[PDB]
């Protein structure tokens, strides 16, 4: 149908907007602390602590499969990266501090992305 195609064009445009957002969020992690999943070979107990692991490469695979229906689902995944880190790592660690900074700096980007998604529909 012609509707399904129109739908697919907007999903594709959302994917386009979210791709740009993801690149901007990832630029706020220059140390690449959140770039890849936490290694289960190197942290074998991780899943006893964190039930829903997330990282920027995993978000990217979902993104490119157009697996994000809306910005809310995307934000959920971003928030997991942050919140998982702030639970597993103590406050005085480079990792915890890196998450706080990504959260703070990320807020500006997500703020504008919400306006852009509402605005363009």
Curated annotation (Swiss-Prot):
Highly expressed in testis. Signal peptide: none annotated. Residues 9-113 form the Bromo domain. It is found in: Nucleus; Chromosome. There is a cross-link at residue 41 (Glycyl lysine isopeptide (Lys-Gly) (interchain with G-Cter in SUMO2)). Component of some HBO1 complex composed of KAT7/HBO1, MEAF6, ING4 and BRD1/BRPF2. Component of the MOZ/MORF complex composed at least of ING5, KAT6A, KAT6B, MEAF6 and one of BRPF1, BRD1/BRPF2 and BRPF3. Interacts (via PHD-type zinc finger domain) with unmodified histone H3. Interacts (via PWWP domain) with dimethylated and trimethylated 'Lys-79' on histone H3. Scaffold subunit of various histone acetyltransferase (HAT) complexes, such as the MOZ/MORF and HBO1 complexes, that acts as a regulator of hematopoiesis. Plays a key role in HBO1 complex by directing KAT7/HBO1 specificity towards histone H3 'Lys-14' acetylation (H3K14ac), thereby promoting erythroid differentiation. This is Bromodomain-containing protein 1. It comes from Homo sapiens. The gene is BRD1. The chain holds residues 555 to 674 of 1058 of the full protein.
């Amino acid at each position: 149908s012609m509707e399904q195609v129109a739908m697919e064009l907007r999903l594709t445009e959302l994917t386009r907007l979210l791709r740009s957002v993801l690149d901007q969020l990832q630029d706020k992690d220059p140390a690449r602390i959140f770039a890849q999943p936490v290694s289960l070979k190197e942290v074998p107990d991780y899943l006893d602590h964190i039930k829903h692991p997330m990282d920027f490469a995993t978000m990217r695979k979902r993104l490119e499969a157009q697996g994000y229906k809306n910005l809310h689902e995307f934000e959920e995944d971003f928030d997991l990266i942050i919140d998982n880190c702030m639970k597993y790592n103590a406050r005085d660690t480079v990792f915890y501090r890196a998450a706080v900074r990504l959260r703070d700096q990320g807020g500006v980007v997500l703020r504008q992305a919400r306006r852009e998604v509402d605005s363009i529909g």
